[PDB]
Design a protein around this nucleic acid. Structure first.
Ligand SMILES: [Mg+2]
Ligand SMILES: [Mg+2]
Ligand SMILES: [Mg+2]
Ligand SMILES: [Mg+2]
Ligand SMILES: [Mg+2]
Ligand SMILES: [Mg+2]
Ligand SMILES: [Mg+2]
Ligand SMILES: [Mg+2]
Ligand SMILES: [Mg+2]
Ligand SMILES: [Mg+2]
Ligand SMILES: [Mg+2]
Ligand SMILES: [Mg+2]
Ligand SMILES: [Mg+2]
Ligand SMILES: [Mg+2]
Ligand SMILES: [Mg+2]
Ligand SMILES: [Mg+2]
Ligand SMILES: [Mg+2]
Ligand SMILES: [Mg+2]
Ligand SMILES: [Mg+2]
Ligand SMILES: [Mg+2]
Ligand SMILES: [Mg+2]
Ligand SMILES: [Mg+2]
Ligand SMILES: [Mg+2]
Ligand SMILES: [Mg+2]
Ligand SMILES: [Mg+2]
Ligand SMILES: [Mg+2]
Ligand SMILES: [Mg+2]
Ligand SMILES: [Mg+2]
Ligand SMILES: [Mg+2]
Ligand SMILES: [Zn+2]
Lengths: 123, 113, 122, 206, 53
RNA sequence: UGGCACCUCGAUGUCGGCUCGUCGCAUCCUGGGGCUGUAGUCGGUCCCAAGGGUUGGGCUGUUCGCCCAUUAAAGCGGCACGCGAGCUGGGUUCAGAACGUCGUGAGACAGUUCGGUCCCUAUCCGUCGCGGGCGCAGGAAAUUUGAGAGGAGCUGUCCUUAGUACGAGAGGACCGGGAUGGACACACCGCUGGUGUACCAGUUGUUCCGCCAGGAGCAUCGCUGGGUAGCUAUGUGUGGCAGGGAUAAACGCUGAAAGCAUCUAAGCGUGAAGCCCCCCUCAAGAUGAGAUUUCCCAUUUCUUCGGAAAGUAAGAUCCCUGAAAGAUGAUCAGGUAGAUAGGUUUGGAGUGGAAGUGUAGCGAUACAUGGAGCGGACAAAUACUAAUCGAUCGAGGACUUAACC
């Protein structure tokens, strides 16, 4: 099945959407072990939408990605959003690799509460 | 879902059944046993539901007889059905038609395609 | 599934029009009766001028239920109401005619007179 | 008296000649090999030892593959013994097929039940609840532990604990169809255990 | 729901037989040759599987 | 029902019901018999027998009792009139108020009536489950014997024998055979159903994604109609089958004491749902520590001797991926000698006809592309991502006698 992360079905839905957007924007983040074993599935299912390139696939992924600016370019300074980067930058990278677009590296316990922290990175 | 069960229970699938959806009228020629005789009894009604997969699939037919509604459930691949007819095809928006149980004449009517 | 304190309408010509269940015959701890089972019951509503009067203790048989029976061939039958026919000491009805459809299982319980009078034996 | 070992595959249904519909359980029983024979002059009792599934040589260990090497076979995964069996048959190293049975045979099914964890009294032992209203505060509790005189509670006072995972024998099960080519046995009804569980099929003792 | 008798020193020491904590599963690093946890990134040389991370 | 006043007033909670039972036999049903003013079907009375079983409601706080309807039967008692650190609080036995009666009065009754705070985080033993240690004269991996213990044990109706035996009739069998149920128990999810908060669809209000279109947040999961895996009963499969040995009450054979008689003294034969077996489960810590098959072998330093430590062999673990397992340990499937988990590609149940575009209509809307799109947990392939690298534990087998040595 799937694991509940100490929060109700509404907090859990929001938590997975913030963490999946951060991995797209930053490509390398600090989380806990259980919290990273879960976004390992919602992110790779999101690259697969980016590898389609459809309008149907883009509209389906737009219901999950948060609306935030990755960075601003002067093409005319126009911002670039996370959905644009997923479909134009991140997805074309893995046009040949079938699966496993992420990897997890263990770091060690956290001082405050002893939680096990890991690196999840987008390669 | 299992590939071994699929192959074992394949010689018993019925190739004579037609294609029908929940929402159209059918007539079932069912073999009925008396004390010593074998006859065929006709059941005509609308298809209410259809569930299952493979040899375990069933369907339900509803009619109103003598002012009382009756529902009859059959396996799809049973050998006790002599033959099955599709009389008319109706337009519905559901896969399960349970709303027809609390609903009487001229309001339980089904449209046609 | 009929137990004590369950009401079910009468489906023949006798004076009774609604009946409440008193006891399910068959065993010491039995608590549920279905199609083809005889129950002890009382008359709660009767039509005027009928043979059977209100407040009378009578026996009766179950002819159709909202949760019907399953046949050996893997098929099921269900009705839209719970119905009832008042019977005598033997298996003969106290009325003259039966109303509505009737399950086939009564033919296996030696209720041959009720089967003959039914408009439809489903 | 015969006997094989198999794996619980799943549940389905078949139609008999009368048109009747029955539930069956699918059991796959390939790769059965006789390993050892036990006699009175060496053990004091008579039995036959059977191995069910072969496994990779990595999973096996040195003591195990020296025991199956006497029968000239690959190391096996499940090994069980059958008693009340005629030792005149069952030569060492032979293959046990599903053809030892036939349609209509009455068998016994031995297996290990599905696992339920820490369970309470009214699920584990099928006890009754207290009232859920009328001011009560007694819903799913064990009951009185006993009288006052002994100054103690007797043995066999049923209480919560680990529920499942125990060996069960179901008696007088019929065989509907035997498929030698697929090494499949069809048994009418239920057998204990989850999917992929080992099932011990033996002829009826009564 | 209230202790009938106070607990002696021997009985209080017997119970704490199992309140110890185990030794960490540490390992010698291949690159920098010092202690680290198995299946973990080395905190000193910042390497795992022979590649810097 | 009482008599006494021996423990308890530095507190031994008092009726009825609920949950959970266990014991006695002076036996309610079922089992086996003797006598009968026992024709048959029914009965009365006594003897053996405690294995299982022993109902749902109306009135009352009620135990009790009467009544309704069933049942094979609706047993009598003990366990602080079993059971409130397990439950309730209707009655009793607190403060308010009223009626009848008694008293000048304040008040009272062992009369009635309406309302009235039931506290506690389990230390020791006891009970139900799960682990660690050492032992079992070497170290290991599997398969097992069963000393001992627990579970189960109930019973109705119909057909045939047979309208036979019996009886003037009315009526109506014993013994035997077959079928099918009630209650209870175990297992399981193919079927009928339930649930199914990371599955599909319809819809209301308001805010947001700059706007249209398409979507997202909040409103019990906003509400409504379905539903996968898993878990489940009211659903399905099966069970108490058929028997053996010794007996109880009882009935007999031979047979003397006591020329006859006698079931008894010696010796024999029948004979119960009961005892011991048969059936299911646990079980070698059964310190009495058992048995079979297979694997590793006889290293090196020290001791004055009993002996010690330090690298290992077979084997296992630390650590990591997990579920068919699980509170945590444990069990089980795996760690590149790789399909263990995620991803990917094909499917499946389920839902029901996606977005975009086009056509018809003034418009809501309808139709086509198209069983479309979506699709947690289900199936098969694939090494793409993570199970990398490493470390630790673990033998060299005492003495005596006996068949051969
Ligand atoms: Mg919400
Ligand atoms: Mg379908
Ligand atoms: Mg409550
Ligand atoms: Mg006294
Ligand atoms: Mg005195
Ligand atoms: Mg005191
Ligand atoms: Mg006191
Ligand atoms: Mg006290
Ligand atoms: Mg008192
Ligand atoms: Mg007695
Ligand atoms: Mg008598
Ligand atoms: Mg008491
Ligand atoms: Mg108490
Ligand atoms: Mg007062
Ligand atoms: Mg006065
Ligand atoms: Mg009140
Ligand atoms: Mg407590
Ligand atoms: Mg089901
Ligand atoms: Mg809009
Ligand atoms: Mg929304
Ligand atoms: Mg908001
Ligand atoms: Mg809902
Ligand atoms: Mg719903
Ligand atoms: Mg028996
Ligand atoms: Mg005998
Ligand atoms: Mg041993
Ligand atoms: Mg799985
Ligand atoms: Mg391992
Ligand atoms: Mg995989
Ligand atoms: Zn390092």
């Amino acid at each position: 099945g799937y694991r509940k992360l100490g929060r109700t079905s509404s907090q859990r839905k929001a938590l997975l959407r913030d963490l999946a957007t951060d991995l797209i924007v930053h490509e390398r983040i600090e989380t806990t072990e259980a919290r990273a074993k879960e976004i390992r599935k919602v992110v790779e299912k999101l690259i697969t939408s980016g590898k389609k390139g459809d309008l149907h696939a883009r509209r389906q992924a737009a219901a999950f990605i948060r609306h935030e600016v990755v960075e601003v370019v002067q093409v005319k300074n126009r911002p670039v959003y996370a959905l644009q980067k997923l479909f134009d930058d991140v997805a074309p990278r893995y046009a040949e690799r079938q699966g496993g677009y992420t990897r997890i590296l263990k770091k060690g316990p956290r001082r405050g509460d002893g939680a096990p922290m890991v690196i999840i990175e987008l390669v | 879902m299992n590939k071994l069960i699929d192959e074992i229970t394949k010689s018993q699938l019925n190739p004579d059944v037609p294609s029908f959806r929940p929402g159209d009228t059918v007539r079932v020629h069912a073999k009925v046993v008396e004390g010593t005789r074998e006859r065929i009894q006709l059941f005509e009604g609308v298809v209410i539901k259809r569930r299952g997969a493979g040899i375990s699939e069933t369907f339900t037919v509803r009619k109103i007889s003598n002012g009382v509604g009756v529902e009859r459930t059959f396996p799809v691949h049973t050998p006790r059905i002599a033959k099955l007819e599709v009389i008319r095809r109706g337009k519905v928006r559901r896969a399960k038609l349970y709303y027809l149980r609390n609903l009487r004449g001229k309001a339980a009517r089904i449209k046609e395609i | 599934m009929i137990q004590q304190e369950s009401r079910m309408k009468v489906a023949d010509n006798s004076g009774a029009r609604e009946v409440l269940t008193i006891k399910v015959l068959g065993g010491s701890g039995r608590k549920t009766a279905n199609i083809g089972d005889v129950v002890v019951c009382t008359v709660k509503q009767a039509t005027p001028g009928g043979v059977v009067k209100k407040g009378e203790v009578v026996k009766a048989v179950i002819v159709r239920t909202k949760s019907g029976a399953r046949r050996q061939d893997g098929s099921y039958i269900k009705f839209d109401e719970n119905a009832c026919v008042i019977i005598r000491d033997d298996k003969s009805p106290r009325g003259t005619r039966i109303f509505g459809p009737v399950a086939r299982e009564l033919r296996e319980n030696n209720f041959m007179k009720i089967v003959s009078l039914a408009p439809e034996v489903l | 008296t015969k006997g094989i070992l198999g794996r619980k595959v799943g549940m389905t249904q078949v139609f008999t000649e009368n048109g009747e519909l029955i539930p069956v359980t699918v059991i796959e029983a390939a790769q059965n090999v006789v390993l050892q024979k036990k006699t009175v002059e060496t053990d004091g009792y008579e039995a036959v030892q059977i191995g069910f599934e072969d496994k990779r040589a990595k999973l096996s260990n040195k003591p195990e593959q020296g025991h199956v090497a006497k029968a000239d076979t690959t190391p096996k995964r499940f090994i069980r013994e059958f008693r009340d069996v005629n030792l005149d048959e069952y030569e060492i190293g032979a293959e046990v097929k599903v053809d030892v049975f036939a349609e209509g045979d009455i068998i016994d099914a031995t297996g290990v039940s599905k696992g339920k964890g820490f369970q309470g009294v009214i699920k584990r032992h099928g006890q009754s609840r207290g009232p859920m209203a009328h001011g009560s505060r007694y819903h799913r509790r064990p009951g009185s532990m006993g009288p006052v005189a002994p100054n103690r509670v007797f043995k066999n006072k049923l209480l919560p604990g680990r529920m499942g995972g125990e060996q069960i024998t179901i008696q007088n099960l019929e065989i509907v169809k035997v498929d030698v080519e697929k090494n499949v046995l069809l048994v009418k009804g239920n057998v204990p255990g989850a999917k992929k569980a080992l099932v011990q099929i033996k002829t009826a003792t009564k | 729901a209230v202790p009938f008798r106070r607990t002696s020193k021997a009985k209080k020491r017997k119970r704490r037989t199992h309140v110890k904590l185990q030794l960490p599963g540490m390992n010698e690093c291949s690159n920098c040759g010092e202690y680290r946890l198995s299946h973990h990134v080395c905190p000193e040389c910042g390497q795992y599987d022979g590649k810097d991370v």
